[PDB]
Amino acid sequence: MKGFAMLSIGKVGWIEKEKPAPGPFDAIVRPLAVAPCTSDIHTVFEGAIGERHNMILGHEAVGEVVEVGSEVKDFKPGDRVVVPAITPDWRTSEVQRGYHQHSGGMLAGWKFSNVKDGVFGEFFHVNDADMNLAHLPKEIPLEAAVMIPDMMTTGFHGAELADIELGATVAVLGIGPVGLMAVAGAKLRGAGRIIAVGSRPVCVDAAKYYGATDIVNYKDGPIESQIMNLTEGKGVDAAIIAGGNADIMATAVKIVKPGGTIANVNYFGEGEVLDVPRLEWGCGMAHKTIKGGLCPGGRLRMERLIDLVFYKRVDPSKLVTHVFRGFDNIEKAFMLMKDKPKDLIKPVVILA
Amino acid sequence: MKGFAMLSIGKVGWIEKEKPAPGPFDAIVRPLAVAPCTSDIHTVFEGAIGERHNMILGHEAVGEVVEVGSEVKDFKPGDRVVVPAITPDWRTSEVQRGYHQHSGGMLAGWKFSNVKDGVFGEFFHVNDADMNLAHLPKEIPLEAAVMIPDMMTTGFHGAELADIELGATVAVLGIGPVGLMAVAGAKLRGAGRIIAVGSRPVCVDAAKYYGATDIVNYKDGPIESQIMNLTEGKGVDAAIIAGGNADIMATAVKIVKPGGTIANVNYFGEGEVLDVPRLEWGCGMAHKTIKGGLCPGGRLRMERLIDLVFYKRVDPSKLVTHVFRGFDNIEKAFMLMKDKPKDLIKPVVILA
Amino acid sequence: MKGFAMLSIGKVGWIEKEKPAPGPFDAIVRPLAVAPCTSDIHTVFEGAIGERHNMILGHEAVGEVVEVGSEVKDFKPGDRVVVPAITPDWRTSEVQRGYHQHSGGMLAGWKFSNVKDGVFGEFFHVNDADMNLAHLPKEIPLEAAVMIPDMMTTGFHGAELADIELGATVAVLGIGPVGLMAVAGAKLRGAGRIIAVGSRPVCVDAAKYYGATDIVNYKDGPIESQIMNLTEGKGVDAAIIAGGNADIMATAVKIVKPGGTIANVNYFGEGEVLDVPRLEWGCGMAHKTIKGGLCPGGRLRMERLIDLVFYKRVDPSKLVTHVFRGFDNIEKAFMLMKDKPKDLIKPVVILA
Amino acid sequence: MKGFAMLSIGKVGWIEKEKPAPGPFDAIVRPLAVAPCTSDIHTVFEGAIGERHNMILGHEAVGEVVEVGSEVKDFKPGDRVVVPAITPDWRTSEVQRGYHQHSGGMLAGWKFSNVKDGVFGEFFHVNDADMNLAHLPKEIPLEAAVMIPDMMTTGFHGAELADIELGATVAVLGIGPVGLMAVAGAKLRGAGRIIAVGSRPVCVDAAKYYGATDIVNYKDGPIESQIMNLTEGKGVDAAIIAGGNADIMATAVKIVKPGGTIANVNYFGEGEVLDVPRLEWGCGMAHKTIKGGLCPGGRLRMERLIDLVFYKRVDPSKLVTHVFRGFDNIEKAFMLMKDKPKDLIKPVVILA
Numbered sequence A, B, C, D: 001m002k003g004f005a006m007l008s009i010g011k012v013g014w015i016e017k018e019k020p021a022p023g024p025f026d027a028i029v030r031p032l033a034v035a036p037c038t039s040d041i042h043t044v045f046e047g048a049i050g051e052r053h054n055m056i057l058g059h060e061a062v063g064e065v066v067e068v069g070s071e072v073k074d075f076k077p078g079d080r081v082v083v084p085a086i087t088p089d090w091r092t093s094e095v096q097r098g099y100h101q102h103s104g105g106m107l108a109g110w111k112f113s114n115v116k117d118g119v120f121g122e123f124f125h126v127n128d129a130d131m132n133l134a135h136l137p138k139e140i141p142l143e144a145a146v147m148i149p150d151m152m153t154t155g156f157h158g159a160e161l162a163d164i165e166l167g168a169t170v171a172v173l174g175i176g177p178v179g180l181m182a183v184a185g186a187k188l189r190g191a192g193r194i195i196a197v198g199s200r201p202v203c204v205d206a207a208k209y210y211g212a213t214d215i216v217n218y219k220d221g222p223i224e225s226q227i228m229n230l231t232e233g234k235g236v237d238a239a240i241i242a243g244g245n246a247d248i249m250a251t252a253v254k255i256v257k258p259g260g261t262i263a264n265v266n267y268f269g270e271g272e273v274l275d276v277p278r279l280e281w282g283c284g285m286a287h288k289t290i291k292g293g294l295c296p297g298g299r300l301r302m303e304r305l306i307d308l309v310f311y312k313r314v315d316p317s318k319l320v321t322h323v324f325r326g327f328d329n330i331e332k333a334f335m336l337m338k339d340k341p342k343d344l345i346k347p348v349v350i351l352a
């Protein structure tokens, strides 16, 4: 078995490993369509999550089941499935507490290319098949399905953590594929006015498409300044962080009004700390809640977004700005993700 | 002043009353647009809410402020306003409890055509104008605006009470204009699949429009069986009740899965008790939460729903199937509500 | 293997079965201390859950692990453990929804004496040891610890479903063991005034001890009237149903104010429906929420209550009014639970 | 009329002014008991809230209503009442969003010794008596009562924001009187283990008195370290911040497990930004929600905490380490708070 992988911090390059074996509960999947993510770029070229050695990358993929363990009951070989970037061990205390995202340690729920071989290989392992895989409906295009395992789920969580109220006006700081899914999320939580913050033109279109009502380019003056202007000093009810500097937090705290919420689904790679503006936080008494969590995973989080897509509640295909054929183009795609061209949102490498 | 009032249970007509006078915190408004409600019919032809004598009916209207108390600070004569069906007294313990709908007593938030002359008059009084009036953007048409005060706020509340999760599948029992807004609200909360129940063609047609993905007619047999079959025995995540007799409650509990919620916004005008089936409620342990509350009123509520219409997140105008002109047509619209003709959803009477 | 079982509705006796065997993830436990429950009385002499054939009763026990599967990592034979009345299979869709109590179906998390042989056997089975067993601290006596599996977790769930707020006055309807634990629960959630309803002197004294501040006897007039008098027409903030007829639901809805909660933990064994007062439930808009749930189970649930007993926040021992020695007394005790003598709260049988 | 006031930053002293007059909805009150608050120290000798000119200090008091506006309905002269440190204008939109503390502006709900003349005067003004005053039962001692307005509501609020679950282990950072009430608060929320951080002997016994089970002296090592050891690498479920430097935020996050909550009620006076460890906050995906808000005020808040004290759910009197007689000592009492003696938790001044 061959596959892309992080050799060492900053060092990438294909390698060779064993076709993994399915435990009695696990399943082995063969990639049907995959995509790269800024998350890999961070942990690889910045050691946000320490160093690793020859660890196949990629967490986003849909594909078919090659073989299942004796105990697997809802998946046969040859079934098409959506594999969540999050595949936690479902029998730990974190789960009983209500946090599979951290089943077995902080962020432990996130296994692929973090603490396990990723989806960028002729085959990949999936722990607890019946709990971590989802049947992919034929009606849903491949390039669209691959947006669910990590873009949709992460973005939507953004909208979930924000406690959006019907008609509330929301601000989405950063409009990359995740930030964009947050704009869709907010629309879905019944947000009224959505203020998206970003410059890449193609993103600005997407944002408007997924629901953005007001675009705010962070090159026409400070962001806090421009928003307080649009909202007339009132501010925003909720603000979701989906990209930017560690100081983006300071910006969000200032634009949300008191009793508002700062929902963060962004992954901070560098910096030893994140700052909170003492004054705008009411010296700690302004009632502005700060949230930040790893996106939900598991079969359910996937069955549900499927429905969202199936019942045309959302169309993630608009995030796919580049479609590459055949395995080989993984490296191309990966790098294409490194130095983000200016016409890019999300690239998808079909395999079969 | 002339007004269409309830004369005595089972009798209605136009009467003569003094033009109301504003207290320092009130405002006197003239109707630009009003609409009749199933509610008034219940309190006039069912005596569901005790009796009344010469109580001007109606509680759905957009108007123009005519005069204001000495303490009103945000509304002047000439201001076009969206008037909430619920005009609570904002200085009570209920308010401090987070239940303004019950400020002063069970359902006391609802004053118009309850314990205070309604809007079906040349002029009508609004208490605490600054807290209970919202400025109506010119962009939004009268017939759409007159949907916010009651239809939209109620419908959406069923949605809110359902605690709908992203992608969940909800059932909306009863698709009158309220049921219709519940569907809309369901879609607004990220609902995936939406099973709408009702038979009137105009409703089934509007339901599909607002987001219903499945139609179930209670005339082809028991709702519970049809819904259980539509869901392959899985049942629905949430059920919003917006119609039917008392036995609709049982039906709700039976179609919702353990841990789901039955959200009620329907006005049960007849009967002594509502029945909850034991076995299907898990003999009291099915974790099937039952909710039932009055629609939210007040300024903020109205502003937010206005934003929904303004930012095209919803277009209530599709609920209007009959529009008449002039004061004399109030009585016609009203009767058009007593005897529900097949092509009706909601009628609006334009006054200028 | 010998064990006390339900032969069929209205029939209970001693039977014989094989010492069960443990799959790779289970453990076999021998009873150290067990107690009977009112829940079994219903299912048997009322067939409230339908027919049952030759099923060992009981589901409240603390015992010693006798053997474990090749996969049980946290429990060796000889380990003293508190076994939860609810032992769900932690790998299902319900668990991913936050309702392990209905893992695999409504009430399916409750296996012992429901759809699996109970704890009144020489030995009994426990599915998923690392997920369904909790180590018993030596500092906690058997007679007290066995109050944790069902009584403490149920009464507390009442308090949990009630959404109690600091200083709020709660009403507990029914002060049996569960009710008594609900009173403790209310107190543990910061309840101010607590009105307990019952009549058994032994129970009343017990309520005062766990936090009751007022005692209403349902043999001195209707509950509603008495409680409306103690609260001066204001009513209570929440009512936790913990016993009574089917009509108890209506009492609850009448005594709680608008926006309050009716939290049921009682398990109704008779009747087709449970009545809901149309008017006192504000015709469906009084915002009076109704909840009913099966007590939490699993390991974490037990560890948390263990802790409450350990750090002395609660002492269940007062529930135990009868203690007996000998495996043959499981019956004496069971029958004791059948025809409730005036001086009995809870009976416990010590086997070793 | 005399009053102890802040003449400017660093300059305190007595002043004379015109006895305030009530608007038709307000009430004038004379203090029966008052108490200095560390908060006032921060705003005087630190200007943590900019500067003020000749503003009577103090905001914690219980007095007797001397007179009321023609609209006040529930309060009369002679009526002994508790006065919440927070008295908002209940007719704002912040109120409609559910955040009275920020009615009309961030923290604008807190008027006394902030943007309004405080309670250290022979008389003071209380706006909107019917919404901002609660009767004081004869049975509650004055020194106990004067604790409710600020210490109790704030400490409890910390515990409320903490989202504490039954049997959870909570950590209280800073056992000042607030922290002391946070502890009782966590005890009231049904917490099991409670780790209290502090070193003042007198506060340590108060902490053990209100429910602490573990004491952590910031002398035997780093807070972060001792708590980890105490929780055997597991960490705490919730962290309630009631003291420390800006860095204390970092400690907190560091000790709460993923998916836990950091609740702050501590008023920071120095610093520009509060630090959040990028790593321990799981790079922002740890799900460690952070909350911080100005304590609740108003009548209900006071009524609820009053019932708590009355029903003996908390005895705040143990916070009162210093009692002073005569209106004149108010100044000494204040100073006693500037230079924190080692045997003081909370000083009180009884006038009559």
Ligand SMILES: NC(=O)c1ccc[n+]([C@@H]2O[C@H](COP(=O)([O-])OP(=O)(O)OC[C@H]3O[C@@H](n4cnc5c(N)ncnc54)[C@H](OP(=O)(O)O)[C@@H]3O)[C@@H](O)[C@H]2O)c1
Pocket: A037, A038, A039, A085, A110, A150, A151, A154, A173, A174, A175, A176, A177, A178, A179, A197, A198, A199, A200, A201, A203, A218, A242, A243, A244, A245, A248, A265, A266, A267, A268, A295, D285
């Ligand atoms: N750990 C996980 O499992 C996981 C999963 C999902 C997501 N995530 C996190 O979520 C992020 C998703 O973002 P993405 O990859 O789609 O795109 P990205 O490149 O990470 O973010 C792009 C967005 O941020 C804006 N931006 C850049 N610098 C900014 C600044 N200083 N202030 C404000 N906005 C700024 C961009 O503007 P332009 O348009 O001008 O470029 C664009 O709108 C991930 O990279 C990762 O951090 C983590």
Ligand SMILES: NC(=O)c1ccc[n+]([C@@H]2O[C@H](COP(=O)([O-])OP(=O)(O)OC[C@H]3O[C@@H](n4cnc5c(N)ncnc54)[C@H](OP(=O)(O)O)[C@@H]3O)[C@@H](O)[C@H]2O)c1
Pocket: B038, B039, B085, B110, B150, B151, B154, B173, B174, B175, B176, B177, B178, B179, B197, B198, B199, B200, B201, B203, B218, B242, B243, B244, B245, B248, B265, B266, B267, B268, B295, B340
């Ligand atoms: N109290 C207030 O102030 C207030 C204010 C606003 C709203 N509301 C609430 O909103 C509603 C107002 O009425 P509305 O506009 O919703 O229209 P409606 O005409 O009252 O109800 C229509 C819906 O009920 C259906 N229906 C009738 N019988 C049924 C049955 N046996 N089983 C299932 N569905 C059945 C209708 O189907 P067909 O098409 O076949 O008839 C339609 O789906 C009330 O429930 C009221 O409580 C109350």
Ligand SMILES: NC(=O)c1ccc[n+]([C@@H]2O[C@H](COP(=O)([O-])OP(=O)(O)OC[C@H]3O[C@@H](n4cnc5c(N)ncnc54)[C@H](OP(=O)(O)O)[C@@H]3O)[C@@H](O)[C@H]2O)c1
Pocket: C038, C039, C042, C085, C110, C150, C151, C154, C173, C174, C175, C176, C177, C178, C179, C180, C197, C198, C199, C200, C203, C218, C242, C243, C244, C245, C248, C265, C266, C267, C268, C295, C340
């Ligand atoms: N399925 C499960 O796993 C599970 C687990 C735990 C609990 N439960 C349920 O919870 C209950 C457990 O037993 P328990 O502690 O509640 O003791 P109980 O003996 O079942 O109930 C005793 C209480 O009900 C009162 N009562 C009886 N009729 C009443 C009426 N008409 N109005 C008001 N109160 C009335 C009793 O009054 P007296 O003082 O005169 O008796 C006492 O206050 C059962 O109903 C059981 O089904 C189920």
Ligand SMILES: NC(=O)c1ccc[n+]([C@@H]2O[C@H](COP(=O)([O-])OP(=O)(O)OC[C@H]3O[C@@H](n4cnc5c(N)ncnc54)[C@H](OP(=O)(O)O)[C@@H]3O)[C@@H](O)[C@H]2O)c1
Pocket: D037, D038, D039, D042, D085, D110, D150, D151, D154, D173, D174, D175, D176, D177, D178, D179, D197, D198, D199, D200, D201, D203, D218, D242, D243, D244, D245, D248, D265, D266, D267, D268, D295, D345
């Ligand atoms: N604005 C408002 O309405 C409002 C209301 C309520 C509370 N608050 C804020 O909360 C504060 C708490 O009340 P308080 O003033 O009575 O007490 P305090 O003096 O603010 O705090 C005392 C506590 O902090 C600990 N402490 C001091 N330095 C520390 C450090 N470096 N690291 C860790 N712990 C440290 C103390 O330890 P020792 O035992 O060693 O002294 C003690 O446990 C209020 O004064 C105010 O700032 C504001």
Ligand SMILES: [Zn+2]
Pocket: A037, A038, A039, A040, A059, A085, A150
């Ligand atoms: Zn990723």
Ligand SMILES: [Zn+2]
Pocket: B037, B038, B039, B040, B059, B085, B150
């Ligand atoms: Zn209506």
Ligand SMILES: [Zn+2]
Pocket: C037, C038, C039, C040, C059, C085, C150
């Ligand atoms: Zn039981």
Ligand SMILES: [Zn+2]
Pocket: D037, D038, D039, D040, D059, D085, D150
């Ligand atoms: Zn203070």
